[PDB]
Design an enzyme around this catalytic site. Structure first.
Site, PDB file in Angstrom:
ATOM      1  N   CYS A 167       0.878  -1.183   0.000  1.00 49.28           N
ATOM      2  CA  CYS A 167       0.000   0.000   0.000  1.00 49.28           C
ATOM      3  C   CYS A 167       0.918   1.237   0.000  1.00 49.28           C
ATOM      4  O   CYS A 167       2.148   1.101  -0.100  1.00 49.28           O
ATOM      5  CB  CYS A 167      -1.076   0.006   1.127  1.00 49.28           C
ATOM      6  SG  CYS A 167      -0.558   0.077   2.866  1.00 49.28           S
ATOM      7  N   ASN A 213       2.032   1.624   4.225  1.00 50.97           N
ATOM      8  CA  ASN A 213       2.269   0.400   4.982  1.00 50.97           C
ATOM      9  C   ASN A 213       1.878   0.564   6.443  1.00 50.97           C
ATOM     10  O   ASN A 213       2.545   0.016   7.329  1.00 50.97           O
ATOM     11  CB  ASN A 213       3.739  -0.075   4.850  1.00 50.97           C
ATOM     12  CG  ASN A 213       3.971  -1.484   5.416  1.00 50.97           C
ATOM     13  OD1 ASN A 213       5.025  -1.770   5.988  1.00 50.97           O
ATOM     14  ND2 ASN A 213       2.985  -2.361   5.264  1.00 50.97           N
ATOM     15  N   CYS A 231      -1.953   1.422   7.208  1.00 53.72           N
ATOM     16  CA  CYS A 231      -3.380   1.144   7.337  1.00 53.72           C
ATOM     17  C   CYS A 231      -3.839  -0.160   6.674  1.00 53.72           C
ATOM     18  O   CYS A 231      -4.302  -1.084   7.347  1.00 53.72           O
ATOM     19  CB  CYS A 231      -4.209   2.308   6.782  1.00 53.72           C
ATOM     20  SG  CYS A 231      -4.020   3.904   7.633  1.00 53.72           S
ATOM     21  N   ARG A 232      -3.653  -0.248   5.366  1.00 53.95           N
ATOM     22  CA  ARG A 232      -4.107  -1.388   4.585  1.00 53.95           C
ATOM     23  C   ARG A 232      -3.292  -2.681   4.556  1.00 53.95           C
ATOM     24  O   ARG A 232      -3.772  -3.732   4.978  1.00 53.95           O
ATOM     25  CB  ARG A 232      -4.365  -0.917   3.158  1.00 53.95           C
ATOM     26  CG  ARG A 232      -5.592  -0.016   3.048  1.00 53.95           C
ATOM     27  CD  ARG A 232      -5.708   0.624   1.688  1.00 53.95           C
ATOM     28  NE  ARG A 232      -4.656   1.619   1.475  1.00 53.95           N
ATOM     29  CZ  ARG A 232      -4.496   2.298   0.345  1.00 53.95           C
ATOM     30  NH1 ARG A 232      -5.322   2.092  -0.669  1.00 53.95           N
ATOM     31  NH2 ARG A 232      -3.514   3.171   0.229  1.00 53.95           N
ATOM     32  N   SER A 233      -2.052  -2.604   4.082  1.00 53.67           N
ATOM     33  CA  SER A 233      -1.219  -3.794   3.944  1.00 53.67           C
ATOM     34  C   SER A 233      -0.886  -4.573   5.213  1.00 53.67           C
ATOM     35  O   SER A 233      -0.802  -5.798   5.163  1.00 53.67           O
ATOM     36  CB  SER A 233       0.011  -3.515   3.081  1.00 53.67           C
ATOM     37  OG  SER A 233       0.883  -2.593   3.679  1.00 53.67           O
ATOM     38  N   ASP A 283      -7.968   3.686   0.742  1.00 47.02           N
ATOM     39  CA  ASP A 283      -7.274   4.241   1.896  1.00 47.02           C
ATOM     40  C   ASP A 283      -8.277   4.714   2.935  1.00 47.02           C
ATOM     41  O   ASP A 283      -9.059   5.625   2.665  1.00 47.02           O
ATOM     42  CB  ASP A 283      -6.440   5.440   1.437  1.00 47.02           C
ATOM     43  CG  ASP A 283      -5.520   5.974   2.516  1.00 47.02           C
ATOM     44  OD1 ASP A 283      -5.657   5.612   3.701  1.00 47.02           O
ATOM     45  OD2 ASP A 283      -4.619   6.746   2.163  1.00 47.02           O
TER      46      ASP A 283
END
Length: 157
Positions: free
Chosen positions: A12, A15, A17-19, A129
């Site tokens: 993301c 690195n 929030c998402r991944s 995001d």
């Protein structure tokens, strides 16, 4: 027993929030399936914005809400990552453009660069995001990741 060890890198922008969520969800899936020893899992960022930071605390709360363990220190993707991983799964089209740009300056690109959401049975192609959003946005990222990771595992290399 024995088998080929595959590797997946979730990516993301920052690195945080998402991944890290995608990584933690995948890691648990393989551990529950008894195939964790066959997989090498990691996550990284396309940028240097959050290097050295723990996951967004809101994502951490979300994970604890679902009992999924999550530990990670943000790091940026490297030229080496393109040679060592089988799969580089990103969250959105900005991540994709970036990864492809970086991959083109690399001598050895073994990885298959794709959108994690391309594996979603429901077709929610982009994992947006959640930074400027709130808790419901993190729960959506989580739900999307569980769907995509389960499906990715069914077709994995």
């Amino acid at each position: 027993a024995e088998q080929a060890t595959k590797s997946v890198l979730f990516v993301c922008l920052g690195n945080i929030c998402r991944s890290p969520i995608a990584e933690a969800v995948f890691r648990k899936l393989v551990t529950d399936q008894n195939i964790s020893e066959n997989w090498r899992v990691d996550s990284a960022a396309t940028s240097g914005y959050e290097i050295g930071n723990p996951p967004d605390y809101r994502g951490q709360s979300c994970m604890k809400r679902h009992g999924i363990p999550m530990s990670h220190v943000a790091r940026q993707i490297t030229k080496e990552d393109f040679a060592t991983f089988d799969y580089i799964l990103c969250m959105d089209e900005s991540n994709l453009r970036d990864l492809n740009r970086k991959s083109n300056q690399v001598k050895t690109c073994k990885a298959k660069i794709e959108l994690l959401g391309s594996y979603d049975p429901q077709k929610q192609l982009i994992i947006e995001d959640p930074y400027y959003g709130n808790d419901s946005d993190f729960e959506t990222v989580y739900q999307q990741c569980v769907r995509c990771c389960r499906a990715f595992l069914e077709k994995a290399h």
